[PDB]
Amino acid sequence: ARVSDYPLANKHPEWVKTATNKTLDDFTLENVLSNKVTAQDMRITPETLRLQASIAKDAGRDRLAMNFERAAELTAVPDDRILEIYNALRPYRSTKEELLAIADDLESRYQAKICAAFVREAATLYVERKKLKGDD
Amino acid sequence: ARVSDYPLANKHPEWVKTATNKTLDDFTLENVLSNKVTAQDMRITPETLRLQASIAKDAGRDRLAMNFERAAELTAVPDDRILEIYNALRPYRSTKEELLAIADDLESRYQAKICAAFVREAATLYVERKKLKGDD
Amino acid sequence: MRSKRFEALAKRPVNQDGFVKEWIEEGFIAMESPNDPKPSIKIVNGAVTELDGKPVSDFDLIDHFIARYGINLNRAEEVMAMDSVKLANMLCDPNVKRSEIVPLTTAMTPAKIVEVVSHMNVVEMMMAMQKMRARRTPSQQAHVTNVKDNPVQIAADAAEGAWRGFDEQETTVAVARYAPFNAIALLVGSQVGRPGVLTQCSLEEATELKLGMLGHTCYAETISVYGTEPVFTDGDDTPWSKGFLASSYASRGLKMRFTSGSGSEVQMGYAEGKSMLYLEARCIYITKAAGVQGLQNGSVSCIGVPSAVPSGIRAVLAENLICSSLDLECASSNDQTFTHSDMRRTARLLMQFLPGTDFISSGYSAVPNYDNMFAGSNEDAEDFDDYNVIQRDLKVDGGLRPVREEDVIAIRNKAARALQAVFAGMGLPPITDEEVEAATYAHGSKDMPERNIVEDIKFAQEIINKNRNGLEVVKALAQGGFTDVAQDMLNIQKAKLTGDYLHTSAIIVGDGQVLSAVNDVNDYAGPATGYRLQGERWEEIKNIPGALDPN
Amino acid sequence: MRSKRFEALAKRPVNQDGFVKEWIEEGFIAMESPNDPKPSIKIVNGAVTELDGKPVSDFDLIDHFIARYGINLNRAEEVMAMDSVKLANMLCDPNVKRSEIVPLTTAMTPAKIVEVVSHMNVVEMMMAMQKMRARRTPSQQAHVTNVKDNPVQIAADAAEGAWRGFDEQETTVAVARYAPFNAIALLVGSQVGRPGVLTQCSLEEATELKLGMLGHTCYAETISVYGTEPVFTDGDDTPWSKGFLASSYASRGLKMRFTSGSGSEVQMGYAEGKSMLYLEARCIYITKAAGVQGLQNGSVSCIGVPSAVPSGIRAVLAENLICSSLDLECASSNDQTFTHSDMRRTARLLMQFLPGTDFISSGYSAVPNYDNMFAGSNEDAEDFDDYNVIQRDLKVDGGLRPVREEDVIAIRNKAARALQAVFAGMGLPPITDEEVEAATYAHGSKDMPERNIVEDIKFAQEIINKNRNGLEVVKALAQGGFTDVAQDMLNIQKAKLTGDYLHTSAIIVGDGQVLSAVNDVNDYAGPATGYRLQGERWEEIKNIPGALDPN
Amino acid sequence: GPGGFLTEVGEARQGTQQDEVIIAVGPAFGLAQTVNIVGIPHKSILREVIAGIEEEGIKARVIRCFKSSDVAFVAVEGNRLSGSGISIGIQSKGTTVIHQQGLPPLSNLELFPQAPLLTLETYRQIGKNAARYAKRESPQPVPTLNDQMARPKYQAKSAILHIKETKYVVTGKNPQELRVAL
Amino acid sequence: GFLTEVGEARQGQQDEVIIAVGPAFGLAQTVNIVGIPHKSILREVIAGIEEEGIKARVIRCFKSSDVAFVAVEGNRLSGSGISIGIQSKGTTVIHQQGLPPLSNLELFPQAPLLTLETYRQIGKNAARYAKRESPQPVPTLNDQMARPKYQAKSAILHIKETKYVVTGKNPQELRVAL
Ligand code: B12
Ligand code: B12
Ligand SMILES: C[C@H]1O[C@@H](n2cnc3c(N)ncnc32)[C@H](O)[C@@H]1O
Ligand SMILES: C[C@H]1O[C@@H](n2cnc3c(N)ncnc32)[C@H](O)[C@@H]1O
Ligand SMILES: [Ca+2]
Ligand SMILES: [Ca+2]
Ligand SMILES: [Cl-]
Ligand SMILES: [Cl-]
Ligand SMILES: [Cl-]
Ligand SMILES: [Cl-]
Ligand SMILES: [Cl-]
Ligand SMILES: [Cl-]
Ligand SMILES: [K+]
Ligand SMILES: [K+]
Ligand SMILES: [K+]
Ligand SMILES: [K+]
Numbered sequence A, B: 001a002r003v004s005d006y007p008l009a010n011k012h013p014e015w016v017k018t019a020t021n022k023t024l025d026d027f028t029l030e031n032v033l034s035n036k037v038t039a040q041d042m043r044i045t046p047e048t049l050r051l052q053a054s055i056a057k058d059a060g061r062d063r064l065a066m067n068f069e070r071a072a073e074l075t076a077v078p079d080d081r082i083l084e085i086y087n088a089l090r091p092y093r094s095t096k097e098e099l100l101a102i103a104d105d106l107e108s109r110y111q112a113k114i115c116a117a118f119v120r121e122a123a124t125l126y127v128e129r130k131k132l133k134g135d136d
Numbered sequence C, D: 001m002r003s004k005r006f007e008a009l010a011k012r013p014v015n016q017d018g019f020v021k022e023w024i025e026e027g028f029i030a031m032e033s034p035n036d037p038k039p040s041i042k043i044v045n046g047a048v049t050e051l052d053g054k055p056v057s058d059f060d061l062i063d064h065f066i067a068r069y070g071i072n073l074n075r076a077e078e079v080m081a082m083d084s085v086k087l088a089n090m091l092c093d094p095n096v097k098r099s100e101i102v103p104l105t106t107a108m109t110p111a112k113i114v115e116v117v118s119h120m121n122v123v124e125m126m127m128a129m130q131k132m133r134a135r136r137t138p139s140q141q142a143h144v145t146n147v148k149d150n151p152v153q154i155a156a157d158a159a160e161g162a163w164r165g166f167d168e169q170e171t172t173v174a175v176a177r178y179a180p181f182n183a184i185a186l187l188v189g190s191q192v193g194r195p196g197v198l199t200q201c202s203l204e205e206a207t208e209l210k211l212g213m214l215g216h217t218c219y220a221e222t223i224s225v226y227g228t229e230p231v232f233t234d235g236d237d238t239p240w241s242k243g244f245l246a247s248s249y250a251s252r253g254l255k256m257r258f259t260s261g262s263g264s265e266v267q268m269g270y271a272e273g274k275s276m277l278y279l280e281a282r283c284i285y286i287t288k289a290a291g292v293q294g295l296q297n298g299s300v301s302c303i304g305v306p307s308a309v310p311s312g313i314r315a316v317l318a319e320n321l322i323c324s325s326l327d328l329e330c331a332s333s334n335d336q337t338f339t340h341s342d343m344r345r346t347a348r349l350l351m352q353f354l355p356g357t358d359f360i361s362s363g364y365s366a367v368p369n370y371d372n373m374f375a376g377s378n379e380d381a382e383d384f385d386d387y388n389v390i391q392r393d394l395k396v397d398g399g400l401r402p403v404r405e406e407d408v409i410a411i412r413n414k415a416a417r418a419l420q421a422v423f424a425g426m427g428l429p430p431i432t433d434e435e436v437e438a439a440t441y442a443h444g445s446k447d448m449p450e451r452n453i454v455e456d457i458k459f460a461q462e463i464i465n466k467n468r469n470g471l472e473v474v475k476a477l478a479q480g481g482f483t484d485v486a487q488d489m490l491n492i493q494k495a496k497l498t499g500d501y502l503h504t505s506a507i508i509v510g511d512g513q514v515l516s517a518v519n520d521v522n523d524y525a526g527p528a529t530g531y532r533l534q535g536e537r538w539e540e541i542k543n544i545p546g547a548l549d550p551n
Numbered sequence E: 001g002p003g004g005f006l007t008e009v010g011e012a013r014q015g016t017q018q019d020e021v022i023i024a025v026g027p028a029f030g031l032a033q034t035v036n037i038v039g040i041p042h043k044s045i046l047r048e049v050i051a052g053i054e055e056e057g058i059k060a061r062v063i064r065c066f067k068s069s070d071v072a073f074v075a076v077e078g079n080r081l082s083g084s085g086i087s088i089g090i091q092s093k094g095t096t097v098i099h100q101q102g103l104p105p106l107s108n109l110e111l112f113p114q115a116p117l118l119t120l121e122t123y124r125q126i127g128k129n130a131a132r133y134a135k136r137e138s139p140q141p142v143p144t145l146n147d148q149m150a151r152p153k154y155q156a157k158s159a160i161l162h163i164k165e166t167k168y169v170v171t172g173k174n175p176q177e178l179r180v181a182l
Numbered sequence F: 001g002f003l004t005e006v007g008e009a010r011q012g013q014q015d016e017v018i019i020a021v022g023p024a025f026g027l028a029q030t031v032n033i034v035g036i037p038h039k040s041i042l043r044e045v046i047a048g049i050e051e052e053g054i055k056a057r058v059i060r061c062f063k064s065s066d067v068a069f070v071a072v073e074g075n076r077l078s079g080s081g082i083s084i085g086i087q088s089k090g091t092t093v094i095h096q097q098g099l100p101p102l103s104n105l106e107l108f109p110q111a112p113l114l115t116l117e118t119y120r121q122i123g124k125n126a127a128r129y130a131k132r133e134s135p136q137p138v139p140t141l142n143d144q145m146a147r148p149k150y151q152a153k154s155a156i157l158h159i160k161e162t163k164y165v166v167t168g169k170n171p172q173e174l175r176v177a178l
Helices: A029-033 A046-058 A062-075 A081-089 A096-110 A115-130 B031-033 B046-058 B062-074 B080-087 B096-110 B113-129 C004-010 C061-069 C077-078 C084-093 C098-105 C110-118 C122-132 C151-163 C176-193 C205-213 C228-236 C238-252 C275-291 C311-325 C342-353 C379-394 C405-425 C433-441 C453-465 C470-480 C483-494 C535-542 D002-009 D061-071 D073-081 D086-093 D096-107 D112-115 D122-133 D151-164 D176-193 D205-213 D230-236 D239-251 D278-288 D312-325 D344-352 D381-394 D403-426 D433-441 D454-464 D471-480 D481-499 D535-542 E040-055 E071-081 E120-134 E150-164 F038-051 F067-076 F116-129 F145-161
Strands: C041-044 C046-051 C141-143 C166-171 C198-201 C219-224 C255-259 C294-296 C329-330 C362-367 C508-509 C513-515 D041-044 D048-052 D141-143 D168-171 D198-201 D219-224 D253-261 D292-295 D328-329 D362-365 D507-509 D514-515 E006-011 E020-025 E058-065 E086-090 E096-100 E109-113 E176-180 F003-008 F016-021 F055-060 F081-086 F094-095 F104-108 F174-175
Touching: A029 C470, A029 C483, A046 A062, A046 F003, A062 A115, A062 C238, A081 A096, A081 C205, A081 C238, A081 D253, A096 A115, A096 F174, A115 C061, A115 C238, A115 E176, B031 C205, B031 D205, B031 D471, B031 D481, B046 B062, B046 C205, B046 D312, B062 B113, B062 D239, B062 D278, B080 D205, B080 D239, B096 B113, B096 C176, B096 D292, B113 D061, B113 E040, C004 F094, C046 F055, C061 C228, C061 C238, C061 C275, C077 D253, C084 C098, C084 C110, C084 C122, C098 C122, C098 D481, C110 C275, C110 C311, C122 C311, C122 C342, C122 D122, C122 E006, C151 C166, C151 C405, C151 D312, C166 C219, C166 D002, C166 F174, C176 C205, C176 C405, C176 C453, C176 C470, C176 C483, C198 C219, C198 D230, C205 C219, C205 D176, C219 C238, C219 D535, C238 C255, C238 E020, C255 C275, C294 D481, C311 C329, C311 C342, C311 D122, C311 D381, C342 D112, C342 D344, C362 D278, C379 C535, C379 D002, C379 D312, C379 D344, C405 C433, C405 C535, C405 E006, C433 D433, C453 D481, C470 F174, C483 D219, D048 D061, D061 D239, D061 D278, D086 D096, D086 D112, D086 D122, D096 D122, D112 D278, D122 D344, D122 E176, D122 F094, D151 D403, D151 D433, D168 D176, D168 D219, D176 D198, D176 D205, D176 D403, D176 D454, D176 D481, D198 D219, D205 D219, D205 D239, D205 D471, D219 D239, D239 D253, D239 D278, D253 D278, D278 D292, D278 D312, D278 D433, D312 D328, D312 D344, D381 D535, D403 D471, D471 D481, D535 F003, E020 E040, E020 E071, E040 E058, E040 E086, E040 E120, E058 E071, E071 E086, E071 E096, E086 E120, E096 E120, F003 F055, F016 F038, F016 F067, F016 F116, F038 F055, F038 F081, F038 F174, F055 F067
Parallel strands: C141 C166, C141 C362, C166 C198, C219 C255, C255 C294, C294 C329, D141 D168, D141 D362, D168 D198, D219 D253, D253 D292, D292 D328, E020 E058, E020 E086, F016 F055, F016 F081
Antiparallel strands: C041 C046, C508 C513, D041 D048, D507 D514, E006 E176, E058 E176, E086 E096, E096 E109, F003 F174, F055 F174, F081 F094, F094 F104
16 A cells, blocks of 8 residues: 555545454444444454555655554454563563563464564573563 | 955054044053043044945945945044034935035035935935925 | 842742753763764674674663664665765755655664764754654644542543644543543543544553553553663663564554653663763664654653753754654653743743644643643643744744633533543442532632542542443443544544554544644745645634734 | 633733734734735836836835845846745755855845745744854843933943943933933943943934944944834934934944834834835845944834734744845844743744844843833843853853853942042042942842932033043043053044944954954854854853752 | 813914923824823823923913824924923823923933823923923933833834824924813 | 661561662661651651551662662562652652552652651551551642752762662661661
8 A cells, every 4th residue: 555545544444344354334333332343343453554564664664564564463462461471571570481482472373473583582682681580 | 455454453454544644553541641642533534444345345245335435435524514414314304405505515625425426315305205394 | 248130140940940060970961972982883794793883792682672673774884974964964954855864864873863963053953853853734742630630620621632732632640540530531531622632641551551452542652762771671671572562552553652851861870871862862763673653752751851961952852853853753842841940941842842843742731730740841731822822923833722711611511521421321439510510610620629539549440450441431421411422432442443543643633534744744845845834724823812903 | 600721821921911913004914914015126227117016206215225225236137036935945055155145135125035034934044044144153232221320330230241241232311311421331331341342322313423423332223214204204314314324423433233123113103004024124125225234123122013913023033034134234132022921032032042143132131121221121130040041951152151249249349430430530420439339239220329310410411512522531540540441441442443343243352353244254054064152162151050060 | 072172272383481381292182092001081191291380380381283293203393382492292192201492303301201101190290390491400300110011011002002193193284272171 | 877787588477568768778878859867757657657557667679779679679578568669869659569560559759749747648558558458548749840959869869879789689677776
């Protein structure tokens, strides 16, 4: 997609589906009140994030697009697990083995390959820079 | 003179004399106390002003130079006559003839040709724009 | 015998401010420090072996993150060889396009871009900022807080701030357990005042992400990064945890920016002997490297540190300029108290107000400063009329507008009634009619009845513990007499499904129209080009209270 | 029921200011009026036959003077043919030299250059002003007055102001007959504070020239010109009488500038339906046409007129920029009260302070504003510490410096003692030791003993009527034990013999050295070029009172 | 026009006796405006100026001037006709000057350049001092009134009032002696 | 010299609150940022705890000078899970085991505003949290000029406090002079 395709809401509302194949028009007050749509339905998809990454690249923002690609992978990870992985990356929280296990989980369960490499990289550097459990 | 000749006080002090042919080093504290020099002696010359006009020209300031040329002529006019002529040019002070007489006197006493022409130019326009005595 | 002249001067508010002499060894120097490294880069087999004098064997986590993710290595050597004076000239030259500069700055090292901007005076920096600002239209962000965490007051103040022109609004908490109430009140009030205003609640990082996951915020900003490794560590993060956090927000469809700012490393005790501006450049490159679209900087909460030393307010403008020059959205501070002097705080604000940034202030206080729970802003609600007058004096769009008292009363009253309906529908501790009336006419929490704080924070934490989400708020409004506000709240939630407002500088204006640097690209090319205040927007700014019609 | 928010705002000082809606028919509009003429010039036989749409047959005295003397006809067809947007771009482009622009701007008609600068925002105007300013070094001018015309206080305040950094100082009179005393006191005190400071006494024109002829002033500035013929007439001059007066000053070796400023024609009742900026352009071209080297403008004493209407403070910067672009010294106002608000007056000041002009202020009040006989300045003596702090915050040379109380006491005391010796030597009504002490420690005239004003003005007018000249002051100092001050007074008089300080932007610095645009030409070419605050001057500005050593 | 209290009784003639002071009012004084810039009535101003002149044993004569609305030039027309050479010029908005024959038009003996600060007591003292100048005394000048916020509060209002005053200028019309209804 | 070490702090039993002080508290600095003596500060915090029938146990922490991490090492050792962290310059936090390190139960983020009455009330509230009560939070103190007056001084005091950090060294129990 190009800059001219942005914003999706104003140019291509029909490009936008949710994780449960609902559309933007499905989210009405009537459908919220009747529970025809719920919070489970209201979550951005990896396809939408990858379309926005395409627009970011067309806008000259390659790093923003890389962020969107990592986010696309992370849509498959549940909220509680997202919080667990974020906390494990904070200083002195994790053993190296725990970080490598998170990376293996990202790759083998959620196919979050970029995010898994990102965590493996942190693991290696947390050894060198002494930010693992027991280093404080 | 050119801008490389400026300031005269540093580059060419000997180019500066006063109305009574005193030089800058004549104005010492002791010469003032002994009345060896007086206020009559402390007046800029047309020669100095015409030098500064040439410097103004060299600095790209032709109108400033023309002001300095008028000022050179006016050094010859006594203080109280300067004030009389200035006042005569203010609105509703003079008849057309009174301004033309001032111009002719500027030339005959002081050879102030540029200033005399300036006064005649004003006199002509004061008729058209009704700024003579009796026009208010 | 005293000089009465000096006795008069000693009483002046500015002489209550904190000033210090430069202290190089501990980083108490704003910019242009002798301990700062000389710009350099070396690359072998596509990987950085040296960064600003430091070999890769000595890299800390910040060096590694920037060297691996933050610099375009294909042009870094070429750009390093460029004359930093010529680059600074290009920055402020109206005839060098923004798109010609971004490929150069994104190939610079942190020390290099600091060397570039340090050749500039503040006039040159402002001239460059109006060009490098990513979004063509400037905007504004407000604080909405009070010392009681009173939710009725937050809703009313938020409606008023939205009505005055703020496109983002921010709350935070005196008592951390109150946060879900503060966030919901801010969101409801903001949508009442102008549907589309984006809202955030600034908390501890794990807490703020969870609150956003439940749908009670629109975005996050205070996602902090730091310029030395020991300070980053006491900030309870690394570049990798903060980069993962950034992508986590995006994966929930939530807009976010980082926050940094000169002087944080001094305040937190480990400047590593470096100037504030050099360390801040490291923070800006961490933000770029993480793929984060924007950054709140300009010292922000640590403004007492650069302001204490020479050229500190110039350094603050410089760090905003580095941010925008690296093609990041800049929410440019002007949000935190540093002086007792009205003259001095106005000079500090004008550096960003005059050229315009993506958010001229990243937290103008929309409440009187006694209620500001970020310990006071550089502007507050009692400055609203002055701010509008200066817009009109200078023909500068500062993002705000004059408003009518009758309109503000009505919008505050509607916001308080809407929140009353939410609390009733969600079985939260009641908002009384007396409180609705008080919030309508209040200046701040001095004018509000006392609430039962113990009961409020019990129910607020139950929102977290029971995972009560934003659709409960939509339903409560829809079923409590506010179907209009319910629809606007649903529309704000629907913005999280499209990814549109994840892009650089994105806000939501008008009829749900996303406005970002993508579709509002800054195209500055000198006089009579780029953003110009004109048309109906200029008519709005001219119409200040008290202008007598002389004929 | 009232909103307490609006009750708080209604009490703000800014809401005491006078604001009006635009009134186009009477010229109550700052710039960009529909009635302003479009640019045009027709030249036949080397003479202008049409100027900005007006045929020569419709010319008033102002048109005739501008058309005959004020426009560089040698580049007039080229610049008239150039696009005004491109010209505005050239003004702020750091790589288009001032020397390349001046031949073209001086060839513009008044409406043309107004059209050019009206394409600019204030950031662009400041970017241009730092380049178009004639003198490379910025300077500063102060008021020294009090409501009693107390000469002892004037001498002491003048010494302090010179010590703080002002290179020009200006007095005027509550009672016009006091003027010779005010002028002598100002001159003596200024030379005590810093030998070389230039002094003026602002009076009715014929009175002021006579006072300068007697040697009791160094220069004159308030040599007023006006932008419509009926207003010029009530100002008691024509372009020809003011041009003759300009040459009269030069013929006595006295530096002078004109004064104009937006809004005078509205204040004096005849704007001829034109915007303030267009009429002010006419005033700037009258100054150019007269061959006068410089101009005080930026609304000056009529600042309540443009500030009342939209874009008035921007227009004030525009008229300063027009002045400098026409290769005139610009003494850029910031000398007159227009607001109750500290925020508002700081924004108005920074427009000139940030880029620098030949005199950033043409009348910073060196006394508390209650003593300011120009009815108050935009800055006064109680702002001295704020002004120095902002210089340090922004690394901007505003022309002033921090000073020690002990030094100011000593310099004020020496000035008061020197004037006491002058008055004794000249047989004037005595200055008592009590008055010397009072002036040493005064903040203003509230701290001074009452003088016999009737006796003072008797002897003051005798100075005029008996033509008592400046050498009497020199003699009295020398005979009363102030040989050094006598020498410095004599040196000031000697500067009237060389013509050197008659040139564009001239001041006298250091050891009698003239510093003007001729030997200090502005060579701005972007970052790291032109005037930069650095070295010992920067060390001086950093050393503000209260900066604690941190370790 | 409402509030009228000034009747033109013919062209003012030059006084010959030295024991008079002329109060010269601008062309709109007491006509299109009946109060000064802060609402003091023109009748009360004139009452006090007249009373101050007369209480010094000097006669007060009132004229209206037309050729300019500028208060200096109004006063100058008055000082030409005043038998003492002393005049007081008063603008509708309240600005006042004590003038003297032989001085430059924009010079003066005393000047009151911030009309918003003048009280009825000031106006009486202005009349007293003018009469004392007519008696060739050197009176203590009326104490200086100066308010650094007067221009911020009132300059725009002053400009608007003066624009309105100027509409009553009549080129070439000599001053008219006034009969005062007091 | 009113604080003496009595050995490594051990895990608590459930009727106690730990006051965890920073590594320079009562040593290189003996007053807080506005001159209140550390001895008086601890006196009032302890007295507020004991007024509630709860025991006060004071420790010094070394691994970080940050008051959140000082309080965290206190709440892991506290038999109630409740701790009070105090920096030399006076910043104070009531913390709770299980919260994120930079969260808390109550926070006092403007040290210049605290009085000895505030410190006594902070101890009182912590002891009530230890008893699983829900006390009214200590009223918010907020001064928009506190940072303008004191942030540079706060930074300098904290730079000096930070010199006493010791990586890897566990907290030491302190005896408070009578
Ligand atoms: C604004 C101002 C002007 C303005 C407007 C004048 C106008 N006629 O509209 C401008 C800049 C054009 C101006 C010019 C002059 N001014 Co003037 N002016 C002031 C100033 C700074 C403030 C007055 C003000 O805003 N008052 C508040 C308003 C609300 O009250 P107001 O009564 O309506 O104010 C009016 C009078 O002040 C009047 N006015 C202003 N200046 C003068 C001078 C004279 C002689 C007279 C009769 C009236 C007059 O104009 C104002 C607007 O209508 C005063 C300083 C002060 N201490 O007050 C000097 C001041 C009064 N002016 C002075 C002088 C010397 C002059 C000039 C003679 C200078 C010259 N180079 O020719 C001219 C006179 C021109 C004229 N026809 O009046 C001196 C008077 C000294 C004395 N004791 O006699 C003062 C004290 C200081 C100064 N040097 O500027 N002035
Ligand atoms: C300056 C400031 C910061 C600075 C300095 C922190 C530091 N450790 O040096 C910066 C910007 C780095 C910062 C970061 C954070 N802050 Co903070 N901070 C402030 C602010 C705006 C002003 C405090 C001040 O200047 N006081 C005046 C000085 C003279 O007194 P002082 O006692 O010396 O001040 C110290 C404390 O305020 C302390 N501090 C500051 N923030 C925080 C947060 C926590 C949890 C703790 C224990 C201490 C602490 O740092 C100051 C200097 O040492 C306050 C607002 C307020 N209402 O006070 C928020 C505030 C206290 N911070 C807060 C938060 C949430 C945080 C973060 C957790 C946010 C994050 N993204 O992680 C981090 C914590 C990092 C840390 N290790 O402390 C919240 C606390 C909410 C609550 N009730 O728990 C507040 C109320 C508002 C806010 N959202 O910013 N903060
Ligand atoms: C107010 C919020 O903004 C963030 N914040 C404010 N100022 C800075 C700074 N200089 N550096 C890093 N983060 C900052 C913190 O997260 C704080 O809690
Ligand atoms: C203060 C002195 O400066 C001059 N002065 C001040 N402001 C202006 C203006 N806008 N136009 C012309 N002259 C002015 C007058 O001479 C006045 O007396
Ligand atoms: Ca913010
Ligand atoms: Ca001046
Ligand atoms: Cl990128
Ligand atoms: Cl020229
Ligand atoms: Cl220093
Ligand atoms: Cl610089
Ligand atoms: Cl308008
Ligand atoms: Cl513009
Ligand atoms: K946060
Ligand atoms: K930083
Ligand atoms: K003058
Ligand atoms: K003008």
